[PDB]
């Protein structure tokens, strides 16, 4: 207003009367301060010249000196001892200008601290005059202080020395003084129509306003305390009206606070004045006026700052890169303001700082939530619009609580110990619960799929909001967002549909977008398998994302997801079978269809792995620990495990039918190769007939291992092994009477065992045997391959049975046998035969012994030895020694025996069974096992070979001796 | 198997669908049962193709029956509607001992027709506990009236003796077969 002019004039009347040489902190030059004041006041120089003319015409104030003289010490003692009380004569030469302070006894110096003005006219022409005269209780003279006033300024306390007047005493002491200079009652109307203190406050307000508007175009980073020339022009009109620093300090505080409430400057510049009220308040007093103004400005700055920290989401947002610093500075001038005695003057506010700060935080959070709700489009009625509004609102509240957790939490807790996050999260879970609960109430019990998805996003956002609780020291008792999952109970059947309708979507497109080709040459499946892995992982991820804390319903959802996954398994199986059918209607290649069935069954195997991973993916182990309490035994294995096992069995079907198809093809090949192998002539060696079957089996199974997973290949190997064992067993009976193809089949079984074992395309059947394998190999090894081998096997079995025979009724012949390793001669001593039977039906025993080495073809060139004949002897005495010329090589061979036609071991004879040469011939007694009419299965297989005559002679004489021994056989009593 | 059918023995509490599925799966019966918590899951590998090729016994087609014993408590009725999504055939069981199970049959059908798998739900209404004649407060005429009004077949099976449960489930499986031969 008009005061901006009149205050301006007062500035001139206080600045062209500036007298004295410049201070270390004050400057004496009119032109620079005048041009700076014109620049700050935005006043054009013609008005400046007009005001200078109007201030020259005002009469000049009569200048005076505020002579503040203090005590004097250091004066040498030439007076009476003690009672030294000199008096000071203040005067200025260029009552009226002289004064004599009264003297006080029993003092080194009088201490009174009073000041009387001394009117003068000129500063550069006048000298200071002050003399001491120490009266004695002679009045001895002391020194004086004489200095030119040009170096005399305001704020000039110093210790000045008294100049000696006579040279008889060199020292006069040092006296403390305080030099000021003030004006008298001045003539301006600006400072006399209004009180000097309020025009000082207004003038200082003018400088601080123009300083903060001239330091920058705006005001946000003004750093100084004041401009230097502005500080000087402040320093005059602060001490030239008899004014101390006390009213200047309160005026500085009032101007700075009202300026801050007018326009923003950084409040660290408020830190310099506020501590001044901390420093100087107790020693001084104020009247009933301006003390209430001090209290009102305290209350107004407090209210402005509290309205600032109530709205700290707007005035200090985290986008201007110094919001926590500026906020901390605002609280740091809010503390150190309540931290003096001067806050005892606040009648509008007595309740303390942390409680009212929390009150402002509470109101600001509530109002911010309300304005955010109005921001998030509530003006359109409807349920999906309100749903998306709530989703945006809870996302914004998640953001606000996140930025209240990292940044704004510590700066509220370190200074005044206020937990922002706990109270903010309590309030903004209550105000959000009361919105989502009503939204889900007006949802009803019917839920649309898009509406269900909206509630699902709201569910996970609110679950994040409740997750933020556990990082805030367990907010309990104020629970209003706990059990928020209850309100989403009507939305559960939609989600478990939609998730399924998501998952069934993917597996519908996965088979649609895939031609079922092998995924590279390092793994064996297609993209449908990895899509299964991702889709079932998505199902399990949805199940984990839900994480229903209620037990029985969580069990119910887990059963729902298990049936969804099993149903998707069956669905996917039907789609790949249909896709294989669709492709087989496209092409007609045998190899393409074969490898298509292959990649289908590796996809099924991959799905089996995924289904096996489902108890780990859906976490049934963590389920059964909480749903095993109120449920029944076996129910967990029935509802969860049993349908999974049925899904695995339904995978086994068309795993064990896709494998079974290839197994049927390969078993047809193996069986036809075996049937064409037995059809070859018997005059060929058994090493070139195996080649076609062997190369076919090798190349087909050894292409097919690279095309199939090892587990399905192991199943295919086991089925093929079982089938070829069955084929070889049924082909082991359709053989000719000579049975010389039995060695071909033995070579076949050996190579088929060794081709199922070769690594890379054969898996070792050495731990998994079946009774068919050993039965076939033993039965056909006894079938193969010559007549002499069968005779040797019969003799080995017969001597094993004879060693197992201990009955003495059939006859016991006592012989001695010695084999020599140095003379080559076998020595046999036959003594006697005991406990015999008659060799004639009349009752006459005929013990006569043919000591033969048998089998006869094993000893082709030797003359057998014989004993003397005996008639009717139950204990005949032979006691004959006979030598036999036979080397040890045929004797150590299997089946070699010494037969006594009336056996005994020949490879186990003493002297050849691992012992030394017998110096004394041991006993050997064996009971005679007569040939039996009930023969072993070996004889009818000798009788198939009729070309040779020796084997036929053997079997005919064996039958004759068997029927003859049956006549002499004594039937046992029942 | 050759077909896989998902029965839901669904009804009220105290009706005893657990005993019905127990007496269909085997011959064992319990005097007292606890209320079903969550849902159960019975399995049966019959070979019927609807019912046996000699009329009631023989080799038809292998039917793997899942027989879900759903809960009758109201706490597991809302979420159980997710299992109605592919639920071929429903076993409405009520008890002739109490009439509240009878009046809740209409509400049960009204809930089922909005959650049916195919174009129309399959229902066989079984008035269980028909051997205990001391507390029978449900007449045959009213039951056959509700059957003919809603078009659903009806039976008077019981689990304490095991009679007629098998025939009821067999003809319901037959009804599902007529519906599949109707759907294609
Ligand atoms: N005498 C008799 N008792 C029966 C018959 N059927 C069931 N009950 C009895 O009635 C009760 C039925 O138990 P239950 O199957 O759990 O009934 P529910 O609770 O309605 N079914 P859920 O267990 O699924 O909740 C048991 O006491 C059973 O013994 C019946 O035909 N005759």
Short mmCIF file of N, CA and C in Angstrom, two decimals, chain A residues 492-493 496-497 500 552-553 555-557 559-560 563-564 567 570 630-632 635 638-639 642-643 646 653, chain B residues 1 4 6 34 36-43 64 66 68 75-76 78-83 85-86 88:
data_model
loop_
_atom_site.label_atom_id
_atom_site.label_comp_id
_atom_site.label_asym_id
_atom_site.label_seq_id
_atom_site.Cartn_x
_atom_site.Cartn_y
_atom_site.Cartn_z
N UNK A 492 -14.79 -68.05 -5.14
CA UNK A 492 -13.92 -69.22 -5.29
C UNK A 492 -14.34 -70.13 -6.45
N UNK A 493 -15.65 -70.55 -6.61
CA UNK A 493 -15.97 -71.46 -7.73
C UNK A 493 -15.72 -70.86 -9.10
N UNK A 496 -11.55 -71.12 -9.58
CA UNK A 496 -11.19 -72.50 -9.88
C UNK A 496 -11.79 -72.96 -11.20
N UNK A 497 -12.85 -72.29 -11.67
CA UNK A 497 -13.25 -72.50 -13.05
C UNK A 497 -12.33 -71.74 -14.00
N UNK A 500 -8.96 -73.12 -14.39
CA UNK A 500 -9.14 -74.28 -15.26
C UNK A 500 -9.41 -73.81 -16.68
N UNK A 552 -10.17 -76.75 5.96
CA UNK A 552 -11.01 -77.70 5.23
C UNK A 552 -11.29 -77.22 3.82
N UNK A 553 -11.55 -75.92 3.66
CA UNK A 553 -11.72 -75.37 2.32
C UNK A 553 -10.44 -75.45 1.51
N UNK A 555 -8.17 -77.81 1.74
CA UNK A 555 -8.21 -79.20 1.30
C UNK A 555 -9.16 -79.38 0.12
N UNK A 556 -10.31 -78.72 0.19
CA UNK A 556 -11.33 -78.82 -0.85
C UNK A 556 -10.84 -78.24 -2.18
N UNK A 557 -10.19 -77.07 -2.14
CA UNK A 557 -9.56 -76.49 -3.32
C UNK A 557 -8.42 -77.36 -3.83
N UNK A 559 -8.20 -80.67 -3.62
CA UNK A 559 -8.86 -81.76 -4.33
C UNK A 559 -9.40 -81.28 -5.67
N UNK A 560 -9.93 -80.05 -5.70
CA UNK A 560 -10.42 -79.47 -6.95
C UNK A 560 -9.30 -79.31 -7.97
N UNK A 563 -8.17 -82.82 -9.23
CA UNK A 563 -9.07 -83.33 -10.27
C UNK A 563 -8.98 -82.51 -11.55
N UNK A 564 -8.74 -81.20 -11.44
CA UNK A 564 -8.53 -80.39 -12.63
C UNK A 564 -7.29 -80.83 -13.39
N UNK A 567 -8.02 -84.31 -14.92
CA UNK A 567 -8.92 -84.14 -16.05
C UNK A 567 -8.21 -83.52 -17.23
N UNK A 570 -6.19 -86.35 -18.86
CA UNK A 570 -7.03 -87.16 -19.75
C UNK A 570 -7.42 -86.40 -21.01
N UNK A 630 -9.08 -83.18 11.52
CA UNK A 630 -10.51 -83.48 11.61
C UNK A 630 -10.98 -84.45 10.55
N UNK A 631 -10.13 -84.83 9.60
CA UNK A 631 -10.52 -85.76 8.55
C UNK A 631 -10.34 -87.19 9.06
N UNK A 632 -10.64 -88.17 8.20
CA UNK A 632 -10.58 -89.57 8.56
C UNK A 632 -9.36 -90.22 7.93
N UNK A 635 -8.73 -91.15 3.96
CA UNK A 635 -9.43 -90.15 3.16
C UNK A 635 -8.44 -89.30 2.37
N UNK A 638 -7.35 -91.29 -0.46
CA UNK A 638 -8.43 -91.56 -1.40
C UNK A 638 -8.75 -90.34 -2.25
N UNK A 639 -9.01 -89.20 -1.61
CA UNK A 639 -9.39 -88.00 -2.35
C UNK A 639 -8.23 -87.46 -3.18
N UNK A 642 -5.44 -91.27 -4.70
CA UNK A 642 -6.03 -92.35 -5.49
C UNK A 642 -6.41 -91.90 -6.89
N UNK A 643 -6.93 -90.67 -7.04
CA UNK A 643 -7.22 -90.20 -8.38
C UNK A 643 -5.95 -89.87 -9.15
N UNK A 646 -4.93 -93.23 -10.36
CA UNK A 646 -5.79 -93.59 -11.48
C UNK A 646 -5.41 -92.81 -12.74
N UNK A 653 -2.20 -97.00 -19.62
CA UNK A 653 -2.94 -97.24 -20.86
C UNK A 653 -2.59 -96.17 -21.87
N UNK B 1 -9.99 -98.83 -18.59
CA UNK B 1 -11.44 -98.75 -18.70
C UNK B 1 -11.89 -98.28 -20.08
N UNK B 4 -15.59 -93.28 -18.08
CA UNK B 4 -15.28 -92.76 -16.74
C UNK B 4 -16.42 -91.81 -16.38
N UNK B 6 -18.58 -89.62 -13.43
CA UNK B 6 -18.41 -88.90 -12.17
C UNK B 6 -19.79 -88.71 -11.52
N UNK B 34 -19.52 -90.25 11.37
CA UNK B 34 -19.28 -88.83 11.56
C UNK B 34 -19.68 -88.10 10.28
N UNK B 36 -19.46 -85.93 7.00
CA UNK B 36 -18.40 -85.86 6.00
C UNK B 36 -17.78 -84.47 5.96
N UNK B 37 -16.46 -84.43 6.11
CA UNK B 37 -15.70 -83.18 6.12
C UNK B 37 -14.97 -83.06 4.79
N UNK B 38 -15.13 -81.91 4.15
CA UNK B 38 -14.68 -81.79 2.78
C UNK B 38 -15.57 -82.65 1.91
N UNK B 39 -14.97 -83.32 0.93
CA UNK B 39 -15.68 -84.30 0.11
C UNK B 39 -14.85 -85.58 0.07
N UNK B 40 -15.53 -86.71 -0.11
CA UNK B 40 -14.85 -87.99 -0.24
C UNK B 40 -14.73 -88.35 -1.72
N UNK B 41 -14.21 -89.54 -2.01
CA UNK B 41 -13.97 -89.95 -3.39
C UNK B 41 -13.94 -91.47 -3.42
N UNK B 42 -15.04 -92.08 -3.86
CA UNK B 42 -15.09 -93.52 -4.00
C UNK B 42 -14.77 -93.91 -5.44
N UNK B 43 -14.30 -95.14 -5.62
CA UNK B 43 -13.95 -95.62 -6.94
C UNK B 43 -14.52 -97.02 -7.14
N UNK B 64 -15.34 -96.92 -15.12
CA UNK B 64 -14.69 -96.43 -13.92
C UNK B 64 -15.58 -95.35 -13.33
N UNK B 66 -16.09 -92.68 -10.57
CA UNK B 66 -15.83 -91.84 -9.42
C UNK B 66 -17.16 -91.57 -8.75
N UNK B 68 -18.29 -89.26 -5.86
CA UNK B 68 -17.95 -88.21 -4.91
C UNK B 68 -19.04 -88.10 -3.84
N UNK B 75 -21.52 -75.25 5.01
CA UNK B 75 -20.19 -74.67 4.87
C UNK B 75 -19.47 -75.17 3.62
N UNK B 76 -19.84 -76.34 3.12
CA UNK B 76 -19.26 -76.92 1.92
C UNK B 76 -20.30 -77.11 0.82
N UNK B 78 -21.27 -73.99 -1.18
CA UNK B 78 -20.93 -72.96 -2.15
C UNK B 78 -19.75 -73.36 -3.02
N UNK B 79 -18.67 -73.84 -2.39
CA UNK B 79 -17.47 -74.19 -3.13
C UNK B 79 -17.65 -75.49 -3.90
N UNK B 80 -18.54 -76.37 -3.42
CA UNK B 80 -18.79 -77.67 -4.03
C UNK B 80 -19.46 -77.53 -5.39
N UNK B 81 -20.03 -76.35 -5.67
CA UNK B 81 -20.62 -76.05 -6.96
C UNK B 81 -19.57 -76.03 -8.07
N UNK B 82 -18.29 -75.90 -7.70
CA UNK B 82 -17.22 -76.04 -8.68
C UNK B 82 -17.07 -77.48 -9.15
N UNK B 83 -17.47 -78.45 -8.33
CA UNK B 83 -17.40 -79.85 -8.72
C UNK B 83 -18.59 -80.26 -9.58
N UNK B 85 -19.25 -78.90 -12.28
CA UNK B 85 -18.92 -78.41 -13.61
C UNK B 85 -18.92 -79.53 -14.64
N UNK B 86 -18.22 -80.63 -14.34
CA UNK B 86 -18.35 -81.86 -15.12
C UNK B 86 -18.74 -82.95 -14.13
N UNK B 88 -21.44 -85.73 -14.42
CA UNK B 88 -22.46 -86.49 -15.13
C UNK B 88 -23.27 -87.30 -14.13
#
